[PDB]
Design a binder for this molecule. Structure first.
Ligand SMILES: *[C@@H]1O[C@H](CO)[C@@H](O[C@@H]2O[C@H](CO)[C@@H](O)[C@H](O)[C@H]2NC(C)=O)[C@H](O)[C@H]1NC(C)=O
Ligand code: NAG
Ligand code: NAG
Ligand code: NAG
Lengths: 49, 50, 99, 45, 99
């Protein structure tokens, strides 16, 4: 309340404040199931080049 | 850079002026009430309750 | 159409003729008045920059627009409470009808 | 349902200080005063 | 899509071909997990609906905190009390907890 009002002294009453209290945030990455694989198997391991 | 500053400061001035206009409308209503109160309360005797 | 203002009615005026009622009616009408709004409050930081640190840092450059908007809305809500208080809370005590 | 403060984009509706029951009680007091005393209850006792 | 928020078990019934939820302000509200066919509601992780009731600092430095429209069991999860200063965890649980 003190900083959100930009003062060191606070009068009587119910003030609405900001949100300075930060929290550490992890990261997540999500993608669909790996499907649809190329013919690389028959291209690298081909019988004859 | 000065255009950015000018836009910001002009917005601040416009906000201040609009707030002043609204507060002046409020004060105009209060002054009309006070004038009516002086007319019907000091210069006379109102039978209007409360 | 050209709207009609009302029903034409000439008054039977005369220098020695008066019209006095012989009966009456007790009419109850209804008058509706608004007294308060919904005490809306906006979280300006979350509205402009919802859960974004970089946006919040950029918004902090614009000074105290956000603060004064919040202050104006708080004033609105307090004013609505005061309006309801002044309209209704005009009786010092709480009377109750006898059985 | 049975946190709506963060579900919307930061917009909340604060409740009024006087609940509808309190407003009803106030109107009840005013109505009883008017019925049982007239205008005297406004001027004084 | 990318964003920041808290993922919670949802109650909605997405259609088989719909992927991303959306609110009226073109903002992501729920998502379908690409691997698991489960719908997760995205509730932003920020609380600005916090009011601090204080007598004048001249008189005392004891204060009370009002969290807007929450239950008293959801408070240490709404404001993430586990990742807060221990002096804020005073005002998230305890014995003086009215609703
Ligand atoms: C004044 O008007 C009232 C109604 O506005 C009259 O009361 C009516 O009287 C007749 C017979 O006397 C009844 O049939 C009606 O039912 C009454 N109406 C109501 C609403 O009670 C009254 O008689 C009138 N008085 C005079 C002197 O004209
Ligand atoms: C994705 O793969 C996991 C295991 O890797 C499986 O349990 C799940 O059912 C799969 N989902 C789809 C939509 O194929
Ligand atoms: C080719 O065969 C080898 C085994 O001899 C295998 O390890 C490799 O993965 C194969 N190539 C591809 C592209 O799968
Ligand atoms: C809060 O807890 C009470 C328990 O009495 C419950 O009835 C109510 O539904 C809860 N509120 C919400 C929003 O779930």
């Amino acid at each position: 309340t003190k900083c959100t009002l930009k003062s060191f002294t606070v009068e009587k009453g119910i003030y609405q404040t900001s949100n300075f209290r930060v929290q550490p945030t992890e990261s997540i990455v999500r993608f669909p199931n790996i499907t649809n694989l190329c013919p690389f198997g028959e291209v690298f391991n081909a019988t004859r080049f | 850079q000065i255009d950015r500053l000018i836009t910001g400061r002009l917005q601040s001035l416009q906000t201040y002026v609009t707030q002043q206009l609204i507060r002046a409308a409020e004060i105009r209503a209060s002054a009309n009430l006070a004038a009516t109160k002086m007319s019907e309360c000091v210069l006379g005797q109102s039978k209007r309750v409360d | 159409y050209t709207m009609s203002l009302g029903a034409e009615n000439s008054v039977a005026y005369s220098n020695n003729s008066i019209a006095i009622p012989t009966n009456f009616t007790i009419s109850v009408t209804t008058e509706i008045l608004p007294v308060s709004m919904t005490k809306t409050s906006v979280d300006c930081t979350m509205y402009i920059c919802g859960d974004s640190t970089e946006c919040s840092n950029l918004l902090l450059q614009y000074g105290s627009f956000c603060t004064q908007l919040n202050r104006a809305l708080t004033g609105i809500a307090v004013e609505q409470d005061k309006n309801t208080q002044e309209v209704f809370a005009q009786v010092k005590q709480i009377y109750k009808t006898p059985p | 349902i049975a946190i709506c403060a963060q579900k919307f984009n930061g917009l909340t509706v604060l409740p009024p200080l006087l609940t509808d029951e309190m407003i009803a009680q106030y109107t009840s007091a005013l109505l009883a005063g008017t019925i049982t005393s007239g205008w005297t209850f406004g001027a004084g006792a | 899509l990318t964003g920041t928020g808290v993922l919670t078990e949802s109650n909605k019934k997405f259609l088989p071909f719909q992927q991303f939820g959306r609110d009226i302000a073109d903002t992501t509200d729920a998502v379908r997990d690409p691997q698991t066919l489960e719908i997760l509601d995205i509730t932003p992780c920020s609380f600005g609906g916090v009011s601090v009731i204080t007598p004048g600092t001249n008189t005392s430095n004891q204060v009370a905190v009002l969290y807007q429209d929450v239950n008293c069991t959801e408070v240490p999860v709404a404001i993430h009390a586990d990742q807060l200063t221990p002096t804020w965890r005073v005002y998230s649980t305890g014995s003086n907890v009215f609703q």
